[PDB]
Structure formats: C-alpha cells, structure tokens
Amino acid sequence: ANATVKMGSDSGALVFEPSTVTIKAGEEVKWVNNKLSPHNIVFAADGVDADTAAKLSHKGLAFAAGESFTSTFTEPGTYTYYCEPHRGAGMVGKVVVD
C-alpha cells in the first residue's frame, strides 16, 4: 500500500498527477521527477500540524529525472502542497489518508 505522483506529465504539463492519490495512515509516498524544473513540493500546514507538515514539506530541489523524495502520512488527514517557484501557474494536487 503506497502512493506515487510524477512531478509533471510526460507530454509536458505542470499540474501534478494524479492530482489526488490514496494513502494509508503510516504509509509513505514517492514523488518521481518527471520534468518542469526547477521545482519542488512544498506542503502547507493548515488542517495539519506544523512540524508534521514541515517534514511533508519538500524544501529541496528536483532537477534531474531520477531524484525522488518521500513522505509519510501518520495522521489520517489531507495534506496539500503548491509549487512556489516553478515557471508557469503553480500546481494543483493533494493527498488523502485512509
């Protein structure tokens, strides 16, 4: 039971897909770098703890299509993230824990 989301589409899209991905409370996720760089996956702590979101928040920088980060959803909620930098029109996509 895992969830993965490619950072962009093959064709050449920005928005992440699948926008929404099912996850389990305790499972991990993998965000493979597809394209559209530089860019990152920043997570906000709205309906979730700060520290928590922090971790979930990727303050890195993916450039090459190989370096993929990972996250862990302990609390059964709904984390959200948005590309701050990027070079288009932000991105839409969130996660959900069961």
Side-chain angles (χ1 to χ4, degrees):
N2 55 105
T4 186
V5 164
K6 324 228 228 200
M7 295 180 235
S9 208
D10 232 317
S11 183
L14 308 119
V15 310
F16 290 134
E17 255 247 315
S19 268
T20 318
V21 313
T22 33
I23 219 258
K24 298 241 195 114
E27 279 297 335
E28 296 143 66
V29 148
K30 200 145 72 136
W31 290 284
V32 174
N33 169 304
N34 165 240
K35 214 221 154 191
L36 281 296
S37 118
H39 95 108
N40 57 22
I41 320 116
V42 188
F43 290 58
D46 240 82
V48 181
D49 326 79
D51 253 57
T52 296
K55 267 165 169 209
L56 261 111
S57 93
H58 298 250
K59 237 97 83 140
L61 229 301
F63 310 95
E67 278 209 298
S68 331
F69 310 120
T70 303
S71 153
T72 316
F73 287 56
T74 327
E75 218 249 297
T78 288
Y79 295 78
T80 294
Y81 48 67
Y82 73 116
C83 231
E84 254 178 74
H86 228 64
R87 201 154 228 187
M91 275 190 279
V92 294
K94 69 185 139 201
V95 185
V96 182
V97 201
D98 237 287

mmCIF file of all heavy atoms in Angstrom, residues 2 6-7 10 13 23 30 33 36-37 39 44 48-49 53-54 56 58-59 67 69-72 81 84 89 93:
data_model
loop_
_atom_site.group_PDB
_atom_site.id
_atom_site.type_symbol
_atom_site.label_atom_id
_atom_site.label_comp_id
_atom_site.label_asym_id
_atom_site.label_seq_id
_atom_site.Cartn_x
_atom_site.Cartn_y
_atom_site.Cartn_z
ATOM 1 N N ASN A 2 1.039 1.826 -1.183
ATOM 2 C CA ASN A 2 1.853 3.020 -1.332
ATOM 3 C C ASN A 2 1.201 3.951 -2.355
ATOM 4 O O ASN A 2 0.226 3.580 -3.005
ATOM 5 C CB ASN A 2 3.255 2.670 -1.835
ATOM 6 C CG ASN A 2 3.185 1.859 -3.131
ATOM 7 O OD1 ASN A 2 3.445 2.350 -4.217
ATOM 8 N ND2 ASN A 2 2.821 0.591 -2.956
ATOM 9 N N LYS A 6 4.024 11.569 -10.159
ATOM 10 C CA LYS A 6 5.073 12.080 -11.026
ATOM 11 C C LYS A 6 4.980 13.605 -11.086
ATOM 12 O O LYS A 6 3.910 14.157 -11.335
ATOM 13 C CB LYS A 6 5.011 11.405 -12.397
ATOM 14 C CG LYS A 6 4.609 9.935 -12.267
ATOM 15 C CD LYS A 6 5.544 9.036 -13.078
ATOM 16 C CE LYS A 6 4.750 8.051 -13.938
ATOM 17 N NZ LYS A 6 5.602 6.910 -14.340
ATOM 18 N N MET A 7 6.118 14.246 -10.856
ATOM 19 C CA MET A 7 6.179 15.697 -10.881
ATOM 20 C C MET A 7 6.035 16.226 -12.310
ATOM 21 O O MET A 7 7.022 16.611 -12.935
ATOM 22 C CB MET A 7 7.514 16.162 -10.297
ATOM 23 C CG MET A 7 7.624 15.788 -8.817
ATOM 24 S SD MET A 7 9.193 16.337 -8.163
ATOM 25 C CE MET A 7 9.815 14.795 -7.514
ATOM 26 N N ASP A 10 4.209 13.614 -18.954
ATOM 27 C CA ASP A 10 5.171 13.313 -19.999
ATOM 28 C C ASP A 10 5.076 14.377 -21.096
ATOM 29 O O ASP A 10 6.057 15.059 -21.390
ATOM 30 C CB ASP A 10 4.885 11.951 -20.636
ATOM 31 C CG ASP A 10 6.078 10.995 -20.681
ATOM 32 O OD1 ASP A 10 7.181 11.477 -21.020
ATOM 33 O OD2 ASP A 10 5.861 9.802 -20.376
ATOM 34 N N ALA A 13 3.230 18.809 -18.929
ATOM 35 C CA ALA A 13 2.262 19.530 -18.121
ATOM 36 C C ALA A 13 2.920 19.962 -16.809
ATOM 37 O O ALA A 13 3.987 19.466 -16.453
ATOM 38 C CB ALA A 13 1.031 18.650 -17.893
ATOM 39 N N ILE A 23 -3.720 7.164 0.191
ATOM 40 C CA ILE A 23 -2.614 6.757 1.041
ATOM 41 C C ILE A 23 -3.165 6.211 2.361
ATOM 42 O O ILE A 23 -4.316 6.465 2.709
ATOM 43 C CB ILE A 23 -1.623 7.910 1.218
ATOM 44 C CG1 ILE A 23 -0.181 7.401 1.201
ATOM 45 C CG2 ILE A 23 -1.933 8.709 2.486
ATOM 46 C CD1 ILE A 23 0.389 7.316 2.618
ATOM 47 N N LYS A 30 5.937 8.603 -2.848
ATOM 48 C CA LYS A 30 7.116 8.838 -3.664
ATOM 49 C C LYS A 30 6.756 9.784 -4.811
ATOM 50 O O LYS A 30 5.836 9.511 -5.580
ATOM 51 C CB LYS A 30 7.719 7.510 -4.128
ATOM 52 C CG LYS A 30 9.183 7.687 -4.538
ATOM 53 C CD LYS A 30 10.006 6.447 -4.182
ATOM 54 C CE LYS A 30 9.665 5.279 -5.110
ATOM 55 N NZ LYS A 30 10.900 4.600 -5.563
ATOM 56 N N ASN A 33 10.491 12.647 -10.217
ATOM 57 C CA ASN A 33 10.683 13.837 -11.028
ATOM 58 C C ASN A 33 10.465 13.486 -12.501
ATOM 59 O O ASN A 33 11.163 12.634 -13.050
ATOM 60 C CB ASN A 33 12.105 14.381 -10.877
ATOM 61 C CG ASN A 33 12.392 15.463 -11.921
ATOM 62 O OD1 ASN A 33 12.268 15.256 -13.117
ATOM 63 N ND2 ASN A 33 12.781 16.624 -11.403
ATOM 64 N N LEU A 36 9.691 19.771 -15.888
ATOM 65 C CA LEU A 36 9.248 21.075 -15.423
ATOM 66 C C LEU A 36 10.076 21.483 -14.203
ATOM 67 O O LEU A 36 9.565 21.517 -13.085
ATOM 68 C CB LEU A 36 7.739 21.069 -15.169
ATOM 69 C CG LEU A 36 6.850 21.187 -16.409
ATOM 70 C CD1 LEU A 36 7.061 22.531 -17.108
ATOM 71 C CD2 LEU A 36 7.071 20.006 -17.356
ATOM 72 N N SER A 37 11.341 21.785 -14.460
ATOM 73 C CA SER A 37 12.244 22.191 -13.396
ATOM 74 C C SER A 37 12.854 23.556 -13.721
ATOM 75 O O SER A 37 12.819 23.999 -14.867
ATOM 76 C CB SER A 37 13.347 21.153 -13.185
ATOM 77 O OG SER A 37 14.643 21.692 -13.439
ATOM 78 N N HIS A 39 11.868 22.975 -9.595
ATOM 79 C CA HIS A 39 10.601 22.961 -8.884
ATOM 80 C C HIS A 39 10.723 22.081 -7.638
ATOM 81 O O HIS A 39 11.683 21.323 -7.500
ATOM 82 C CB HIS A 39 9.463 22.526 -9.809
ATOM 83 C CG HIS A 39 9.148 21.050 -9.742
ATOM 84 N ND1 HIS A 39 8.007 20.553 -9.138
ATOM 85 C CD2 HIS A 39 9.836 19.970 -10.212
ATOM 86 C CE1 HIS A 39 8.018 19.233 -9.244
ATOM 87 N NE2 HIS A 39 9.153 18.873 -9.909
ATOM 88 N N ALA A 44 1.736 22.753 2.963
ATOM 89 C CA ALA A 44 1.254 23.721 3.934
ATOM 90 C C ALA A 44 0.656 22.979 5.132
ATOM 91 O O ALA A 44 0.188 21.850 4.997
ATOM 92 C CB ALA A 44 0.245 24.656 3.264
ATOM 93 N N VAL A 48 -3.382 20.444 9.377
ATOM 94 C CA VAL A 48 -2.419 19.507 9.932
ATOM 95 C C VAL A 48 -1.429 20.264 10.818
ATOM 96 O O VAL A 48 -1.368 21.492 10.778
ATOM 97 C CB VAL A 48 -1.738 18.728 8.806
ATOM 98 C CG1 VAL A 48 -0.728 17.724 9.365
ATOM 99 C CG2 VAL A 48 -2.772 18.030 7.919
ATOM 100 N N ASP A 49 -0.678 19.501 11.599
ATOM 101 C CA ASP A 49 0.307 20.085 12.493
ATOM 102 C C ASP A 49 1.389 20.784 11.668
ATOM 103 O O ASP A 49 1.581 20.468 10.495
ATOM 104 C CB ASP A 49 0.983 19.009 13.345
ATOM 105 C CG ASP A 49 0.086 17.832 13.732
ATOM 106 O OD1 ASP A 49 -0.107 16.955 12.862
ATOM 107 O OD2 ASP A 49 -0.387 17.835 14.889
ATOM 108 N N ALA A 53 3.610 18.849 8.865
ATOM 109 C CA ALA A 53 3.609 19.369 7.509
ATOM 110 C C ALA A 53 5.050 19.625 7.065
ATOM 111 O O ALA A 53 5.428 19.284 5.945
ATOM 112 C CB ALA A 53 2.745 20.631 7.446
ATOM 113 N N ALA A 54 5.816 20.223 7.965
ATOM 114 C CA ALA A 54 7.207 20.529 7.679
ATOM 115 C C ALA A 54 7.835 19.362 6.915
ATOM 116 O O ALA A 54 8.179 19.498 5.742
ATOM 117 C CB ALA A 54 7.941 20.832 8.987
ATOM 118 N N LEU A 56 6.588 16.732 5.643
ATOM 119 C CA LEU A 56 5.850 16.508 4.411
ATOM 120 C C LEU A 56 6.254 17.565 3.381
ATOM 121 O O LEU A 56 6.159 17.331 2.177
ATOM 122 C CB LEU A 56 4.346 16.463 4.689
ATOM 123 C CG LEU A 56 3.724 15.069 4.787
ATOM 124 C CD1 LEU A 56 3.288 14.763 6.221
ATOM 125 C CD2 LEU A 56 2.572 14.912 3.791
ATOM 126 N N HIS A 58 8.602 19.509 1.154
ATOM 127 C CA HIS A 58 9.869 19.259 0.489
ATOM 128 C C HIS A 58 10.556 20.589 0.174
ATOM 129 O O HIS A 58 10.207 21.258 -0.797
ATOM 130 C CB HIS A 58 9.669 18.387 -0.753
ATOM 131 C CG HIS A 58 9.115 17.014 -0.457
ATOM 132 N ND1 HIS A 58 9.866 15.859 -0.583
ATOM 133 C CD2 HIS A 58 7.877 16.625 -0.037
ATOM 134 C CE1 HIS A 58 9.104 14.826 -0.255
ATOM 135 N NE2 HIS A 58 7.872 15.302 0.084
ATOM 136 N N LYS A 59 11.520 20.934 1.015
ATOM 137 C CA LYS A 59 12.259 22.172 0.839
ATOM 138 C C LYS A 59 13.573 21.879 0.114
ATOM 139 O O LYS A 59 14.598 22.496 0.403
ATOM 140 C CB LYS A 59 12.443 22.882 2.183
ATOM 141 C CG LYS A 59 11.864 24.298 2.139
ATOM 142 C CD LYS A 59 10.447 24.329 2.713
ATOM 143 C CE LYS A 59 10.476 24.422 4.240
ATOM 144 N NZ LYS A 59 9.424 25.345 4.723
ATOM 145 N N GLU A 67 16.023 11.780 -9.016
ATOM 146 C CA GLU A 67 15.941 12.050 -7.591
ATOM 147 C C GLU A 67 14.482 12.249 -7.173
ATOM 148 O O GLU A 67 13.874 13.268 -7.495
ATOM 149 C CB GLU A 67 16.790 13.265 -7.213
ATOM 150 C CG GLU A 67 18.260 12.875 -7.043
ATOM 151 C CD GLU A 67 18.955 13.785 -6.030
ATOM 152 O OE1 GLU A 67 19.014 15.003 -6.306
ATOM 153 O OE2 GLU A 67 19.413 13.243 -5.000
ATOM 154 N N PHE A 69 11.777 12.230 -3.921
ATOM 155 C CA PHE A 69 11.647 12.339 -2.477
ATOM 156 C C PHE A 69 10.600 11.358 -1.944
ATOM 157 O O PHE A 69 9.986 10.621 -2.714
ATOM 158 C CB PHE A 69 11.189 13.768 -2.178
ATOM 159 C CG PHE A 69 12.020 14.848 -2.874
ATOM 160 C CD1 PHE A 69 11.426 15.705 -3.747
ATOM 161 C CD2 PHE A 69 13.352 14.950 -2.619
ATOM 162 C CE1 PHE A 69 12.198 16.707 -4.393
ATOM 163 C CE2 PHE A 69 14.124 15.951 -3.266
ATOM 164 C CZ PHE A 69 13.530 16.808 -4.139
ATOM 165 N N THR A 70 10.429 11.382 -0.631
ATOM 166 C CA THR A 70 9.467 10.504 0.014
ATOM 167 C C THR A 70 8.809 11.212 1.200
ATOM 168 O O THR A 70 9.413 12.088 1.817
ATOM 169 C CB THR A 70 10.192 9.214 0.403
ATOM 170 O OG1 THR A 70 10.733 8.735 -0.825
ATOM 171 C CG2 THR A 70 9.228 8.110 0.842
ATOM 172 N N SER A 71 7.580 10.808 1.482
ATOM 173 C CA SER A 71 6.833 11.392 2.582
ATOM 174 C C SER A 71 6.116 10.294 3.370
ATOM 175 O O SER A 71 6.009 9.161 2.905
ATOM 176 C CB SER A 71 5.825 12.427 2.076
ATOM 177 O OG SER A 71 4.709 12.557 2.951
ATOM 178 N N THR A 72 5.642 10.670 4.549
ATOM 179 C CA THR A 72 4.938 9.731 5.406
ATOM 180 C C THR A 72 3.743 10.412 6.075
ATOM 181 O O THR A 72 3.904 11.414 6.771
ATOM 182 C CB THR A 72 5.945 9.154 6.403
ATOM 183 O OG1 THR A 72 7.089 8.856 5.608
ATOM 184 C CG2 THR A 72 5.509 7.796 6.955
ATOM 185 N N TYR A 81 -0.089 20.766 -1.061
ATOM 186 C CA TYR A 81 1.166 21.402 -1.426
ATOM 187 C C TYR A 81 1.011 22.226 -2.706
ATOM 188 O O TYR A 81 0.098 21.989 -3.495
ATOM 189 C CB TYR A 81 2.156 20.264 -1.683
ATOM 190 C CG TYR A 81 1.607 19.152 -2.579
ATOM 191 C CD1 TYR A 81 1.328 19.409 -3.906
ATOM 192 C CD2 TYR A 81 1.391 17.892 -2.059
ATOM 193 C CE1 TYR A 81 0.811 18.362 -4.748
ATOM 194 C CE2 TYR A 81 0.875 16.845 -2.902
ATOM 195 C CZ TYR A 81 0.610 17.131 -4.205
ATOM 196 O OH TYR A 81 0.122 16.143 -5.002
ATOM 197 N N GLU A 84 5.935 26.836 -5.234
ATOM 198 C CA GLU A 84 6.144 28.256 -5.009
ATOM 199 C C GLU A 84 6.904 28.873 -6.186
ATOM 200 O O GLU A 84 6.472 29.878 -6.749
ATOM 201 C CB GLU A 84 6.881 28.500 -3.691
ATOM 202 C CG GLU A 84 5.929 29.042 -2.623
ATOM 203 C CD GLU A 84 6.657 29.245 -1.292
ATOM 204 O OE1 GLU A 84 7.433 30.221 -1.212
ATOM 205 O OE2 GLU A 84 6.420 28.418 -0.385
ATOM 206 N N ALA A 89 2.118 28.273 -13.765
ATOM 207 C CA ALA A 89 0.969 28.689 -12.978
ATOM 208 C C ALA A 89 0.752 27.694 -11.836
ATOM 209 O O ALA A 89 -0.174 26.886 -11.880
ATOM 210 C CB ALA A 89 -0.256 28.809 -13.888
ATOM 211 N N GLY A 93 -2.868 19.686 -6.644
ATOM 212 C CA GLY A 93 -2.722 18.298 -6.244
ATOM 213 C C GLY A 93 -2.627 18.172 -4.722
ATOM 214 O O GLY A 93 -1.956 18.971 -4.070
#
